[PDB]
Amino acid sequence: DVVMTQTPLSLPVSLGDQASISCRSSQSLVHSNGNTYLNWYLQKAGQSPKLLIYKVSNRFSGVPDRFSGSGSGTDFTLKISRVEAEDLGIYFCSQTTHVPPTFGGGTKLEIKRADAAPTVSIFPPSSEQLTSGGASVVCFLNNFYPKDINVKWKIDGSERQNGVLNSWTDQDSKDSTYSMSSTLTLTKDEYERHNSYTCEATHKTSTSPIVKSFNR
């Protein structure tokens, strides 16, 4: 297995910049017959991958002039000249030289903007649920940038992980933010057993954590 290593994970650009992506191999992809089999794929969200460039510099029929690849042996690059909106997606490298075929981790290009601190909201359990025997507390953390946040729940000062559920927005095509939900699912008796519920968002926008709590 020839390990592929694409960096960075998220390349943030603005429209019309150059996008530069690196792909490194655990050994030469130059085949014993002179050809090097390094391939690049774009997967736009909600769709499949497509062949942008096989064998390091050849554009597959239909790819535009703004995608051209370069490199040799173990180190390879894709440079997008002017990032249009339809170039946003996940770019994956592949090597077909050795068995098995292997791909590299992927690279997401997200549009840049300033920061945005998360607007947190903490939600007490619904009456309807407590009748059904459950208690789940939801924190909503909306419109922030970058996609990097830490959310810790603290049920009476002490923190809790066992039983957290978390989900994510991709980039909003309005104001290029991310949003998140964190649902701590407790049981009616754990809920009755305890009183203050804390939800904390640690992210570059505050050095001091963004906090949100309630007491039952």
Partner: protein
């Protein structure tokens, strides 16, 4: 060159699911049908390939174990059978054609999710996340709706039968143990709420569930 693939395949652990890819595009191009796996969100693993016009089969030696490749070349259909399935195997599975020197897959099918769960069509509980004392950001009162416990995916969560769009944020459905969970928020002026109905509105159409839930004070 176009490729035909299977439906989503919801099954319980211990299953031997079979998917097919019948291509109708690459005829006489003595090509290969490729199969690749796409994990949750991004990661890709190669499974193998089969030549219709020959019967040449090869596997990533780590899938050589859970998959097998078949081709009824006449019918243009080549099948992958994933036997012994565990929770992990819930992913997209891709078909892909390759020809000539490129050694690149240029034509990928549409994909098929093979979701594994030991549960039958559980309809969902839907709960009102009225801002039970987050109090105010002046302007911002963010309400929510918690759809929890359904199976399988999807649900259609509108807010006020479609005319409440701006400020909505529905998060992707993640599976608590075998069952799904989903929530949306709706963010507003301090005067629509409480004065006007903001009803969360869930249909889980696979189980004939339709539920409007009013988010009142």
């Amino acid at each position: 060159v176009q490729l035909q693939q299977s439906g989503p395949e919801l099954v319980k652990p211990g299953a031997s699911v079979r998917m097919s890819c019948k291509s109708s595009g690459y005829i006489f191009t003595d090509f290969y049908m490729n199969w690749v796996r796409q994990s949750h969100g991004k990661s890709l693993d190669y499974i193998g390939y089969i030549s219709p016009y020959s019967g040449v089969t090869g596997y990533n030696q780590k899938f050589k174990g859970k998959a097998t490749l078949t081709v009824d070349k006449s019918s243009s259909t080549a099948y992958m059978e994933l036997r012994s399935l565990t929770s992990e195997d819930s992913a997209v599975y891709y078909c892909a054609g390759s020809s000539g020197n490129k050694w690149a897959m240029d034509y990928w099918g549409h994909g098929a999710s093979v979701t594994v769960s030991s549960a039958k069509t559980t309809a969902p509980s839907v709960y009102p996340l009225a801002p039970v004392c987050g109090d105010t950001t002046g302007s911002s009162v963010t309400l929510g709706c918690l759809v929890k416990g359904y199976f399988p995916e999807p649900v259609t969560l509108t807010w006020n039968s479609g005319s409440l769009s701006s400020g909505v944020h529905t998060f992707p459905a993640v599976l608590q143990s075998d069952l799904y969970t989903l929530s949306s928020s709706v963010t507003v002026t301090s005067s629509t709420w409480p004065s006007q109905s903001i009803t969360c509105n869930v249909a889980h159409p696979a189980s004939s569930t339709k539920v409007d839930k009013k988010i009142e004070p």
